[PDB]
Amino acid sequence: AALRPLVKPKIVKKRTKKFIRHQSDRYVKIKRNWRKPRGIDNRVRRRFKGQILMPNIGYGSNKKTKHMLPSGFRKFLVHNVKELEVLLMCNKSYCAEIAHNVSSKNRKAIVERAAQLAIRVTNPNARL
Amino acid sequence: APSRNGMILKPHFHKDWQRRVATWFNQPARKIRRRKARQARARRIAPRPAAG
Amino acid sequence: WRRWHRRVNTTQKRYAICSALAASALPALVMSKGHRIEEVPELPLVVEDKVEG
Amino acid sequence: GVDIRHNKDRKVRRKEPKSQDIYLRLLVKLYRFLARRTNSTFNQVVLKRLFMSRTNRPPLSLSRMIRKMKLPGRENKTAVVVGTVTDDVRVQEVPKLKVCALRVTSRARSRILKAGGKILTFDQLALDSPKGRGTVLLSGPRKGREVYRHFGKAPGTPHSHTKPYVRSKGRKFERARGRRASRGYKN
Amino acid sequence: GVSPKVRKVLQLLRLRQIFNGTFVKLNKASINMLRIVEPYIAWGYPNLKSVNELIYKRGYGKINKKRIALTDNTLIARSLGKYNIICMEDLIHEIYTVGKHFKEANNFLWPFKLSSPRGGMKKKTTHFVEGGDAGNREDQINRLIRRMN
Amino acid sequence: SAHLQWMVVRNCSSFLIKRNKQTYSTEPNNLKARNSFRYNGLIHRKTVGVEPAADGKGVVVVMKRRSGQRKPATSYVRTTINKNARATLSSIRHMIRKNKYHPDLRMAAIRRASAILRSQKPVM
Amino acid sequence: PSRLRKTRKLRGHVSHGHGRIGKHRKHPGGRGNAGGMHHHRINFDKYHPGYFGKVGMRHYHLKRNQSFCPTVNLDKLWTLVSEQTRVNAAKNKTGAAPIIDVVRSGYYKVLGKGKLPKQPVIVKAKFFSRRAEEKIKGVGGACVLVA
RNA sequence: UUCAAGAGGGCGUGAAACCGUUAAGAGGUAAACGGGUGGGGUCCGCGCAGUCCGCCCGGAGGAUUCAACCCGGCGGCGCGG
RNA sequence: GACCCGUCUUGAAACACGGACCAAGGAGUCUAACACGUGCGCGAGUCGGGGGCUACGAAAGCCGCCGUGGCGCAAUG
RNA sequence: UGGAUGGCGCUGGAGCGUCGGGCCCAUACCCGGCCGUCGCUGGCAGUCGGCAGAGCGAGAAAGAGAGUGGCGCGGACGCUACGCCGCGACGAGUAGGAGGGCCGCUGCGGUGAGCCUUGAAGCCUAGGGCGCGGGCCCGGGUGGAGCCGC
Ligand SMILES: [Mg+2]
Ligand SMILES: [Mg+2]
Ligand SMILES: [Mg+2]
Ligand SMILES: [Mg+2]
Ligand SMILES: [Mg+2]
Ligand SMILES: [Mg+2]
Ligand SMILES: [Mg+2]
Ligand SMILES: [Mg+2]
Ligand SMILES: [Mg+2]
Ligand SMILES: [Mg+2]
Ligand SMILES: [Mg+2]
Ligand SMILES: [Mg+2]
Ligand SMILES: [Mg+2]
Ligand SMILES: [Mg+2]
Ligand SMILES: [Mg+2]
Ligand SMILES: [Mg+2]
Ligand SMILES: [Mg+2]
Ligand SMILES: [Mg+2]
Ligand SMILES: [Mg+2]
Ligand SMILES: [Mg+2]
Ligand SMILES: [Mg+2]
Ligand SMILES: [Mg+2]
Ligand SMILES: [Mg+2]
Ligand SMILES: [Mg+2]
Ligand SMILES: [Mg+2]
Ligand SMILES: [Mg+2]
Ligand SMILES: [Mg+2]
Ligand SMILES: [Mg+2]
Ligand SMILES: [Mg+2]
């Protein structure tokens, strides 16, 4: 009822939330982006108990299930029709994601061509 | 405040040098001026020797 | 008076010219540069002297 | 918890060259091959010497090759220098040779071909002799630069011959106090 | 918190972690070394069984500065063929009765990785005489290998 | 030569593409389309290319000879196959096998053309 | 190459690579070479011995042309005259000798350093040295002066 | 009136702090956060009878239909000892 | 489970100081010299930087009886 | 100031002294999975195919050694060598040092037969997702003329 991936492995991840900057909610001029705090009084860098955790490398993911969509496909970014001849050999692993600025008179001829080659397109009903 | 081992040296910049700085951006537009005032000199005296 | 200009040696300027003439003869380093050379019959293309006329 | 000091776990030797040319990396691709596959250590020495810098593969002059080839026993024997070969003019009698170097200067190349010699490259050393037999290996003077006359024990310090850094040597640049015996001291 | 003269010894018997065990042959020149670290060790004299249940279970080799286990005789017979030691039961006759070639089968054995003792030690610091765990205990060490091994 | 211009082309060509931690290539006679030494088609003396027919049906096969290498006009040769499914794959297994012509590119030059025959079917 | 420096990798660190206890102030130890004799004494007594004092005689209107005298060795004395003259000179049985001019080639004085191959020469120069004269008298050939 | 007042005489775009009103969910240890679940909402599944591709046997259908020879054209290796 | 962040400090939650709130702007740069590592060319020699000759181009290319000159090849009193 | 075996409270103890058995838990020790660095200067140019025949991991320095009278038209993946694959031990960290950044901004030579009034930048978002992270990408709204990747 879809285009099946080749093999469907069980995706496990080691952390599902984000990281937020320390003292981000008390202010507004503090964004929710990560900046390694460099004080000397501090509690986060010295890893007290019950505080905000930090981004070490141990949260890295397995090289077999990295960058994998939940459907089991990798992504690839496409502007025109000419770059879908790339994927007629690498087919069952990677998927195409049509860019934003492409207007709605061309996506009618890209998605049809990407239905003969049996290539999955992530956003096939974008504009209409 | 010299460190371990470097040569001693005395720079001559204790004066105000930024006021008197002679740039040379003229140079490829003065070799053309001298080339014109030498060829129009070489055509004023038509059969004479050009080099003095 | 920031140091705008640079100078390079002579015998490196001439080695770059010999190393840029030696790769305008292969039909792969020209196609991969981007030109459209699918049909030209000979890559060191030498034409008669009546083009200056 | 284990009280190993992690101070010198990483070796600081060099693996691969910093050079971006491709006529060196096409020969490294052939002796990376011939260093893990064959048994003999001539390849494992020349590989190590194709990584080092310019100031650690110094130029071998030709009269240290006539000297280091006139030694009895080494007849009909090719040389291998990973460095370069420059010409000399203070030699009037050159014998025939068989040299395998990188760069041969255009006065000495023509000095040897007139004397009936022969210059190979490091691909025809591979066709001629892979496992390293019947090659005399050389190198140039390592500690020959002028820098190595500044180093060592600091001057003004007894029993120490060492050139200091002077902007110009003369009759009043560093001659006076620590050197004479009447102006203070000597060392 | 370790004394510097001690830590050299515990790195001359190759005892780097906590809960590491080795086999040491005895003489006058190694009793006085094992006397200076009486507060940190608990040594004994093992039975025949607790050499089997340390070689067969927690016994790993040392092949080229690595740690490769023992699943065949040919892993021994590479590095000990020059001593007529071609299996495991010759290495055990050597350790139990200490043969001439004890050094070349004790530098080869990687230090053992024991677990935490079940049940619980009495008190770590003091001597085994006054109700501790350190010091000599000549044949109670098989009541600490059947517990930890 | 070959290893000279792989050491040149491997990173600064224009048929090359880099995005999403990936790498592809748009050479005119490539298959699997990815930048490697064996699947480039501008360097070697012998190259295999498989293209769709210029018309709606069929599969063309672009070879390359050895005589006129520097003459890009008559260096290649195009043939056209418009047949059923078995004998086309057999006449490509034969073109690449029984001439000993670059035998490394056989299975991928059958897979890509069995995907052109899958492609040019009337869709339901 | 602003992008290869160090300060572009230090945006985020507070002190910018110069400490926090004793900060990077302007001039701690005087400006330039201050304290040759007071408190930078050890650097000059250990790395520039004899920085301090006077020695010798003064000489006021000193030119660098009255004492112009470039040198040469006997090693490369044959490099001035081209190769085919040393050949014809070693080839002829008569007993002639090729004349070597140094002043023409930009040298005045003839010193003597190395071995010299055995064939007769005649040297026109302005000075000599005693070893470099007894090597040519020992091979055979002369030493001719010129003003 | 204009394509447009969602461009109205300091009139392109119209950001946050901030305030007004609407809808929801709460409220005795100042509020806020971290780790962990649970409930309630908004939404997507363009989910709501769930794989496909090879190969053989069987069942029924139909073509412009195979192997082989014959001419014509191209291409490849040639150690022709 | 959990005291508010920056900062000097042996020692910050501190009865130590600056800080009501949001947007934009904001702090190791530029020459000369020297020292050492490193990449490139030529090699006992090397370098044309000043001078000449023939839209982009105020660029590029040449000159050796224009190599004078600089550093180097020989130190010491 | 109204207050401290930590609190409530505790006398066949929940008090003091000597000792038994059994049980609780930390990021410590063992075993297992995953990331990353270091390390063996570890392993692959032998995809050698009807001219072929499928090789060296075996306890014992050295050639499945060469010369010698003694029917069918068939065989996965790979290797951007700055790559890919395998085995071991290790990982705390201020001032400070170094390396990698397919993180990012504004601009120039090159190049994408790039995209764009069938709607670009920029904003907004209880919309869908990836990355250790810096950050980016997509859908849905406003907006009206120039923009991005290598
Ligand atoms: Mg502190
Ligand atoms: Mg200082
Ligand atoms: Mg550990
Ligand atoms: Mg450390
Ligand atoms: Mg238990
Ligand atoms: Mg820091
Ligand atoms: Mg610093
Ligand atoms: Mg400061
Ligand atoms: Mg101080
Ligand atoms: Mg400073
Ligand atoms: Mg509008
Ligand atoms: Mg407005
Ligand atoms: Mg409101
Ligand atoms: Mg409510
Ligand atoms: Mg609590
Ligand atoms: Mg302060
Ligand atoms: Mg102070
Ligand atoms: Mg104080
Ligand atoms: Mg301090
Ligand atoms: Mg503080
Ligand atoms: Mg103050
Ligand atoms: Mg205040
Ligand atoms: Mg700003
Ligand atoms: Mg240098
Ligand atoms: Mg636990
Ligand atoms: Mg483990
Ligand atoms: Mg660490
Ligand atoms: Mg919001
Ligand atoms: Mg407008």
Spatial separation of the C-alpha atoms in residues G50 and A125, rounded to whole Å: 87
Which residues have C-beta within 8 Å of that of residue D6, sequence separation ≥ 6? none
Do chain D and B touch: 3 or more Cβ pairs under 8 angstroms? yes
Spatial separation of the C-alpha atoms in residues G108 and G124, rounded to whole Å: 9
The amino acid that residue E37 corresponds to is V
- The phi-psi region of residue F33 (left if phi > 0; otherwise alpha if psi is between -120 and 50; otherwise beta) is left
- Count of residues making up chain E: 149
DSSP codes, D4-39: ---TT-S-----S-S---TTTHHHHHHHTHHHHSSS
User: What's the sign of the alpha-carbon dihedral D70, D75, D76, D77?
Assistant: negative
Yes or no: say if E67 and E61 are a contact pair by the CB < 8 Å rule. Answer: yes
Which secondary structure element, helix H or strand E, spans residue A36, and what is its range? none
Mutation to test the G interface, candidates B3, B4, B7, B8, most G Cβ within 10 Å: B8
Spatial separation of the C-alpha atoms in residues G47 and D152, rounded to whole Å: 12
Q: D75 forms bridges with which residues in the sheet?
A: none
Distances in whole angstroms, Cα of residue F69 to Cα of each of C39, F7, F96, G4: 13, 21, 20, 44
Q: Report CB contact under 8 Å: F119, A117.
A: yes
Yes or no: say if D87 and D97 are a contact pair by the CB < 8 Å rule. Answer: no
CA of residue A21 relative to chain centroid, distance: 22
CA of residue D114 relative to chain centroid, distance: 27
DSSP G49: T
- Count of residues making up chain A: 128
Yes or no: say if F20 and A75 are a contact pair by the CB < 8 Å rule. Answer: yes
Helical segments of D73-150, H only: 109-112, 124-128
Yes or no: say if G143 and G137 are a contact pair by the CB < 8 Å rule. Answer: yes
Q: Report CB contact under 8 Å: B4, G30.
A: no
Yes or no: say if E62 and E109 are a contact pair by the CB < 8 Å rule. Answer: yes
Spatial separation of the C-alpha atoms in residues F95 and F113, rounded to whole Å: 14
Spatial separation of the C-alpha atoms in residues G100 and G109, rounded to whole Å: 13
DSSP codes, E82-147: GGT--SSHHHHHHHHTT-S--GGGTSSSPPP---PPSS--S-SSSBTTTT-SBS--TTSGGGTHHH
Nucleotide J120: closest residue by CA–C1': A101
CB atoms within 10 A of CB G122: 15
Which residues have C-beta within 8 Å of that of residue A86, sequence separation ≥ 6? F17, F24, F26, F33
Q: Is D167 on the interface with G (CB under 8 A)?
A: no
User: What's the sign of the alpha-carbon dihedral G132, G136, G138, G142?
Assistant: negative
| Portion 5-34 of F in contact with C at CB < 8 A | 5, 8-9, 13-15
In angstroms, the CA of D7 and the C1' of J92 are apart by 15
Closest Cβ opposite residue B2 in set G27, G28, G40: G40
Distances in whole angstroms, Cα of residue B3 to Cα of each of D127, F104, G43, G109: 55, 64, 8, 44
SS3 F51: strand
Yes or no: say if A65 and A12 are a contact pair by the CB < 8 Å rule. Answer: yes
**How many Å lie between the centroid of ligand 24 and the Cα of residue D18?**
15
Judging contacts by C-beta atoms under 8 Å, the chain D residues touching residue G78 are 92
Yes or no: say if G96 and G116 are a contact pair by the CB < 8 Å rule. Answer: no
Q: D85 forms bridges with which residues in the sheet?
A: D60, D104
Distances in whole angstroms, Cα of residue F6 to Cα of each of C31, C34, C43, D19, F11: 14, 17, 20, 17, 9
**CA of A29: nucleotide with nearest C1':** I22
**How many Å lie between the centroid of ligand 10 and the Cα of residue B1?**
10
In angstroms, the CA of A51 and the C1' of H36 are apart by 14
Experimental technique: cryo-EM
> Which of these, D92, F62, D59, lies nearest to G81 by C-alpha position?
D92
Neighbours of chain B (3+ CB pairs under 8 A): D, G
Q: Report CB contact under 8 Å: D26, F7.
A: yes
DSSP D78: E
Which residues have C-beta within 8 Å of that of residue F85, sequence separation ≥ 6? F114, F117
Do chain C and F touch: 3 or more Cβ pairs under 8 angstroms? yes
Distance from CA of A39 to the nearest CA of G (A): 9
CA of residue C24 relative to chain centroid, distance: 5
Strand order in the sheet with D60-61: D60-61, D84-86, D103-104
The amino acid that residue A35 corresponds to is R
Q: Which ligand is nearest to the CA of G29?
A: 2
Judging contacts by C-beta atoms under 8 Å, the chain F residues touching residue A115 are 123
In degrees rounded to 5, what are phi and psi of residue G11? Answer: -70, 105
DSSP F80: E
Q: D104 forms bridges with which residues in the sheet?
A: D85
Angle at G94 between CA G90 and CA G97, to 5 degrees: 55
> Which of these, E35, E70, E32, lies nearest to E52 by C-alpha position?
E70
Q: Report CB contact under 8 Å: B8, D167.
A: yes
> What is the token pair recorded at A55?
């981004």
Which residues have C-beta within 8 Å of that of residue G56, sequence separation ≥ 6? D171, D172
Where do we find the tokens 């000397």? A40
Spatial separation of the C-alpha atoms in residues G50 and D177, rounded to whole Å: 4
> Which of these, G137, D1, D15, lies nearest to E20 by C-alpha position?
D1
Yes or no: say if G128 and G107 are a contact pair by the CB < 8 Å rule. Answer: no
DSSP G98: P
| Strand-strand pairing, G121-125 and G99-101 | parallel
What is the structure's resolution, reported in angstroms to one decimal? 3.8
DSSP G11: B
Judging contacts by C-beta atoms under 8 Å, the chain G residues touching residue A41 are none
> Which of these, A111, A109, A106, A108, lies nearest to A122 by C-alpha position?
A111
Distance from CA of F52 to the nearest CA of A (A): 11
**Beta-carbon neighbours within 5 Å of ion ligand 20:** A 41
Mutation to test the F interface, candidates D20, D22, D29, most F Cβ within 10 Å: D22
Closest Cβ opposite residue F13 in set C26, C32, C44: C32
> What is the token pair recorded at D175?
């001659």
Yes or no: say if G76 and G102 are a contact pair by the CB < 8 Å rule. Answer: no
**CA of F101: nucleotide with nearest C1':** H76
Where do we find the tokens 């050939």? G141
Spatial separation of the C-alpha atoms in residues D106 and D86, rounded to whole Å: 9
Mutation to test the D interface, candidates F4, F5, F7, F43, most D Cβ within 10 Å: F7
| Portion 1-30 of D in contact with E at CB < 8 A | 1-4
Which residues have C-beta within 8 Å of that of residue D81, sequence separation ≥ 6? D60, D65, D99, D100, D101, D102, D137, D138, D139, D140
In angstroms, the CA of G60 and the C1' of J70 are apart by 106
> Which of these, A111, A128, G69, lies nearest to A120 by C-alpha position?
A111
Q: E69 forms bridges with which residues in the sheet?
A: E60
DSSP A88: G
Distances in whole angstroms, Cα of residue D185 to Cα of each of A13, D176, F5: 75, 10, 67
CB atoms within 10 A of CB A86: 21
Residues of G near A (CB-CB distance < 8 A)? 12-14
| Strand-strand pairing, D78-80 and D84-86 | unpaired
Distances in whole angstroms, Cα of residue A64 to Cα of each of A9, A57, A69, G10: 9, 17, 12, 35
Neighbours of chain G (3+ CB pairs under 8 A): A, B, D
Distance from CA of F71 to the nearest CA of D (A): 27
In degrees rounded to 5, what are phi and psi of residue G70? Answer: -75, 160
Q: D120 forms bridges with which residues in the sheet?
A: D100
